[PDB]
Each structure stands twice: as structure tokens, then as C-alpha cells.
Design a binder for this molecule. Structure first.
Ligand SMILES: [Cl-]
Ligand SMILES: [Cl-]
Ligand SMILES: [Zn+2]
Ligand SMILES: [Zn+2]
Ligand SMILES: [Zn+2]
Ligand SMILES: [Zn+2]
Lengths: 222, 222, 222, 222
């Protein structure tokens, strides 16, 4: 017995309550949406953006994937990015990781010979890890795990800022801000891990890796 | 203007309110997760699964992408599927489309020459459309849109069922059901489009495309 | 003992002979290339385009993959396509399949539950197969295999013509032709399976699937 | 103008000429293939492996893409790797870059905002570049280009070695070597850049990045 009845009943009860409380709660976004936020976070069942920020339908457009990864070569994450920045004109991009992230643990501990698609998928985390060996070697398994989480949020903010989409948006004057935040499943709170970035100037100040050199590498050539 | 303060206050208020109603609402989920559902749905800002099924943290692991598309060759969606079926051992997979879906409209109206990554990405939508062109010819814009959304849900339910991850899970007797639902953003309500599929037999009864023929094609060669 | 010596010696011997015969054979393409052909064919070791067409370096730009597949969502094949049409201004695209293609056999006979990346990868062939059940059911394994090969070449020519790259090139007046050909490893010969396509007009005439309806689907709506 | 006749005559002439020199040149390869090599190389029209190593049909299975890039998350290249190592049981993997490589130049000079898929695709080249920025600072355009080509070969040899497919093959005692070569289009000559790697021990001796640390990172956690 798989039977969706309880789910459907809970959905009807929820829809009624919201409309009873505000009669245009739903009808106002019947035929259109204008979110101001894109949120990129982990598929993990404990981390639901609309509910942890207590948001109404129509406020946050959402990519959720194993590990909250952003890569220029993932058309799944990239079309979420292009569609919200180019078509919907969002103003803020939230990259959120969270403690006790299983993707980030697999990234520390799995041997690359491990079978299946998840191990391909988290290659990104291994690479972030490998560049940051000096911050992780010799920590206890637990501290290394937490640290892996933060380091990944920082890498993924950098990847957002370096993406063709965000770079083209900045170059044409479209206001757009990027945010690194992390969530703790055990307390329900979100901490700002990286202050707002609104263009190259902020990025130079706020990120370890050098975004200007990434974009304009050929200036450092003779 | 780029300040995150409104969001953090909201998150605080939200976390206290939940910790009041229930002492262990967060603490019980601090170091692991045992969700029973995987949800695959559209990235659209109006369709938030934990909110709309009114679920607590830890109940639904989430993939969201533009058009709620499921392909064997997308490692982003596939790793959500593999990690939940193989590692977390979920029992139910929700495939959820929604009326007023911009991805589905784009898959009806855009010309293939359109530049950018969203247009590459929604190629699956054109395939569903083309296979079912007889069902869509001479309907009105708005009716073809609604029909496209529904055909897309059915196609994606087929793709979940046909996936290596689900086929392997069934073949080793892991119990796993797959469901097609559609959400109406204007009313907040979910409607079951496809009754529960728990194995090959259900799929023979419930899907228009032949799953058995797909899996055992060579049985019908001389 | 892995030792590249024999390979390197054969390469030196070959380079000498060609330069001895035509002293600018290599030097003329030292610093640049201007191929007129893109070739898309199978990774299979028996099928080398430059050698079967007896071509000099600098003549045919080459994508080779398992099964000779073209999909808008494969950035590997797609960047080969964009780079040669947009940057190098090639004039002709050869899509070549071949008999005794192992990808095309796996596409007939593997069960989708089969582990590993090749089985994900050839999902494209299964889909071509599924649409063409009526041409394949009841044939002997051998005739079905040959037929699968031709059907795949036709699908992939259609995919070339439908790609954003080729569509944008035609729409801006750039001359570009697409060709379906097949090769027989046992005789070293190539047969033209589909006559030249240079735009929509030819495509309407030469391909079973309807390219015009694919591009302009919304014209058939009320 | 779109006529294929010149090509078919060339193919004929070519097939007869080979069938004369050797009776069974094609017939011996008509129904199967047992290549000993997999070659991964650039799609560039001047670099044809079977031609340049002067090989007969059936000897080298080929992947070619723009920049000869190897990533765990590209199913196109990965299926070439899995099918050859696991099904065909090849013994040697050639990773081949080439001077004058347009992909490598693009990875030095293009700004990330550049539109289209080639720019997404060559993101791996920017990563190699960035990790090795110290090695490239204040070199001249042309020298940085040559150094980029070489660093790219080494990075891609590392990625082949680090892949799940090769790590699994070694771990079950399958003999498998990996080689880094570079071709000079101006002279037709190949130079060995990296001596043969046949297992973990060779990679410790031959590669600048630490393969063991990459595979066994968690050994160095407290
Ligand atoms: Cl969500
Ligand atoms: Cl080749
Ligand atoms: Zn996580
Ligand atoms: Zn949608
Ligand atoms: Zn083949
Ligand atoms: Zn190249």
C-alpha cells in the first residue's frame, strides 16, 4: 500500500487555511510569477528554502541538487540560472550549504573507484577539497566535515560569480547580488557566511580566489 | 539594498516559533535524515513541496529543475535518484508538474534557433511534444499548454520507471512506488494524475507507452 | 612493459615519408586550419574518417563517440558543432554510422537496469528504437541490428538539422550542408544513405520526421 | 556544390588499393574489433590518430573532443573510457594534446561572459590554467600557449588515472597503462610528454599532483 490520500488531504487542508487567511494568496500568482530570489541549495530533506525563510508562493525560484553544486557544464543548474536572471530578472542569488551535508562527507571519504552516478556527480567536491588540503588535513573527521561545508559554499559562490550568466548580467548593468549562507539542520538557523557581492569590486574584497584574474587572465601575460 | 537582514529575522522568528510548538522539531533531525519521499518538481517559485504538503524537516528529499524533467543522461537529477533509492532507501517518488509552467510553454512555442542554455535544456519537452503531436494539433494556446503539462508529467513518470536506478531497485525486490501529480498554482491544490505504480505490472496498466516492451524489446526479435 | 617506442618510430617514419613527398604537407597548417568538413562518427576502432576518405591533415574536423550520437544536451558534441560552424565556417557535416556497431546492438538488447555509464549514454539509441518498433519487431537479430544502424543515422541527421547551431546558421544565410552516410567495416566502403540537405526545403523532402513542424510547432495550434 | 562524389571516389580508390596490398585488410575486421589502444585527442582537423601512428583498421578506438578534455561528469568521454576498459579490454590509453590548440588559446584569452556552448565546455581549461597560474605569469602569448597545451595534457592524464573506470581496473589487477603525448601539427611528429603509468606507483613518480592523496584523502584525517 502506497496511497497518496494523507498527502492530498494535508495539501487541501493547507490550501484552505492559507486562502481563508488571505483570499488572494494563490489567485494573485495564478498566471504569472515575479520572484526576486534564486536559491541554490542541497537536495537534503531537512533544508527547504521557502519554509526556513517563511516565504509565500512566488518569492524564491529554487535549484536543489546533491551538494548544492554550480558548474558551467551542468545544464540543469545553468538553465535555472539563465532563466531567472535573463527572463525573470531576479535581483539576489542565494547559495546555501548546510552542516551534516552527506554530499560533503562523501566528497571527503569516498574512494574514486566507487560505482554509480553519485560518485561521478560529487567530483566537484573532491576538487574543492584537493585545493584546500592545508585547511583539512589533520583535523578530526567532524571538524573536517564542517569545514568542507563552508569551503564548498565559498567555491560555489565563486562559481556563481564566474558563470557566463552572472558575468553578462553585470557587464550590461543589471543589478544582481550573490550571497553565501549556511544552514544548521539541528537548530533551524541560517548564518551569513559571505557578505553580499554585487560586482567585481565586492568579489575582489570578499572571496579568497581571485575573480578578476579569472576573468581577465590574459592581462597578466607579456 | 543588497542587505539580507529581513531574511535572517524571518528565519529566526520561524525557528523560535517551531521550537516553541515542539521541543525537538530541529534537534531530532540534527545528525541524520530518514525521508520516505523523493520529490522531483519544477524550479518555478510558486511550487514548494514541503510547504504545499505541509511537511516537517526530514520528510521529502528534493530535486527541482526547469520543467521537472528526468533524463538518464542528466547526472544532477540522476544522483538525486540514486542517492535516495540506494543510500537513503526512500519508498515513494513524487513526479510533480504544474499548470502555468513556463518550461512547457517554451517547449511549445520557441524556435530551436533560440540562443542560450534554457533552450538546450528544454529539448526533452520538445520530444514529448513531438511524440504526442496528434494530441495537440488544433487545440487553443491555453489548452495545448495544459495538455503539454500533463503529457510531460506522464513522460517523466515513464522515465523514472525506466531508469536504471528504479529498474534495479524493483529487480532486487526493494519496495518503491512512483506517482504523477500536478499542482495548480492559482488554488494551491495538487491533483493525482497517475495512480501509484509499484512495479512492472502497475506500469502496464497505467502508462500509455509500453514499459515492458521498452525493457524487453529483444524478446520480440526473431 | 608498456613502451611507446614502436608507435613513435612509426610516427617518425610516416611524417618523413609525407614531407619527402610534399615538402609543405605539414608546414602549411603549422599555425592554422581551415577544414571544410565536420565529421560525426563512432568511436569504433575500424572507422577512421581521414583515412577512409584518404584526406590530408587540415581537411576534416572530427567528433567520434560511442554510437555517433548528437544531442542538444551533450556539450561535448555540441561544442564541436558550434566551434566548426560559428568559428571555422565549415561547409559540410558528415554524420556517419557503420554496420556492426556495438552501440547500436547494446541499444537493441541491453536491459535498462544494466550498471555503468555506457548504458546511460546509449539511452538515445533506445529512444530511436522505441519510435521505430514497427520496423524492427520480428526481424532476425542480424537484420534488426543493420536496420538499427540506418535508423540511427537518420535520427542523428535530423538532430544535426534541428540543432540550434545549424538552425541559426541557415537562418543567417550561411551555406551549410548535412549528409547521412554509413560505412561497412568488412569492405571499407561508404554508402550515401541520405542525399544532401542544405536547408528546410531539402529536409522536408529527404527526412521521414517533419523538421518544419518541429521548428514551427505553434503554427499548428489554434 | 553540396555533392559528395569526390569523397566516394576517394573512398573507393582507397578501399581497392588496400584490398590489393592485403587480401584480408577489411574482411578480417568485418564482425568484430580487438583494439589495444584508446586514444583521447583534440577534434582539431590536423590530428588524426590512425593516420599519424600509421595504423590499420581495428587498432585504436577513438574519442575526440575540443581540447582533448577528460572529465568524470562528461558521459560522452566516460562511455568511451568504460566501454574500452570494461568491454573491449584495451591495454593502453593515449592522452594526446597538440601545439597550436585553439581550445587551449581560448582557455587563456576568452572572458567568461562569452556566449555559446564552446565557452561552457572549455571551463576545464580555465581550471587547469588557474591552478597553474604561477607557471604562466609574465610569459609571452605564444609561450603561455605552448605551456597551457602541456599542462593540459598532464591534467587530463591525471583525470584518466583518477577516473572510477581506471581506478577500478587497476584495483582488480587489469593491466592498463596511460600515456601523455603531444603532437606538433607543423611537423607531423609526436613527442612523449609523460612516461608510461601502469599503476599507483608510477603516478606517484610521474605526476605533479598527488594521485594517492586524491584517492586516500581521509587517511590523513584525525
Ligand atoms: Cl523546495
Ligand atoms: Cl579520427
Ligand atoms: Zn547536503
Ligand atoms: Zn514550471
Ligand atoms: Zn559503432
Ligand atoms: Zn585542439
Amino acid at each position: 500500500t502506497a496511497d497518496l490520500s494523507p498527502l492530498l488531504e494535508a495539501n487541501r487542508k493547507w490550501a484552505d487555511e492559507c486562502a481563508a487567511k488571505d483570499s488572494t494568496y494563490f489567485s494573485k500568482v495564478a498566471g504569472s510569477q515575479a520572484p526576486e530570489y534564486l536559491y541554490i541549495g542541497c537536495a537534503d530533506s531537512r533544508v527547504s528554502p521557502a519554509q526556513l525563510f517563511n516565504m509565500a508562493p512566488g518569492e524564491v525560484f529554487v535549484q536543489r541538487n546533491v551538494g548544492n553544486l554550480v558548474s558551467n557544464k551542468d545544464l540543469n543548474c545553468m538553465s535555472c540560472l539563465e532563466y531567472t536572471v535573463d527572463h525573470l530578472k531576479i535581483k539576489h542569488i542565494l547559495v546555501c550549504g548546510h552542516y551534516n551535508c552527506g554530499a560533503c562527507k562523501a566528497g571527503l571519504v569516498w574512494h574514486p573507484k566507487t560505482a554509480g552516478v553519485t560518485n561521478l556527480w560529487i567530483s566537484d567536491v573532491r576538487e574543492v577539497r584537493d585545493k584546500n588540503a592545508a585547511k583539512l588535513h589533520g583535523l578530526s573527521a567532524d571538524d573536517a566535515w564542517d569545514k568542507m561545508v563552508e569551503l564548498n559554499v565559498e567555491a560555489q559562490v565563486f562559481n556563481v560569480c564566474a558563470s557566463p550568466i552572472v558575468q553578462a548580467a553585470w557587464a550590461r548593468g543589471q543589478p544582481l547580488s550573490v550571497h553565501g549562507i549556511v544552514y544548521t539542520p539541528g537548530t533551524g538557523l541560517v548564518k551569513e557566511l559571505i557578505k553580499p557581492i554585487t560586482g567585481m569590486e565586492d568579489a575582489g574584497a570578499l572571496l579568497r580566489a581571485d575573480l578578476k584574474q579569472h576573468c581577465f587572465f590574459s592581462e597578466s601575460l607579456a
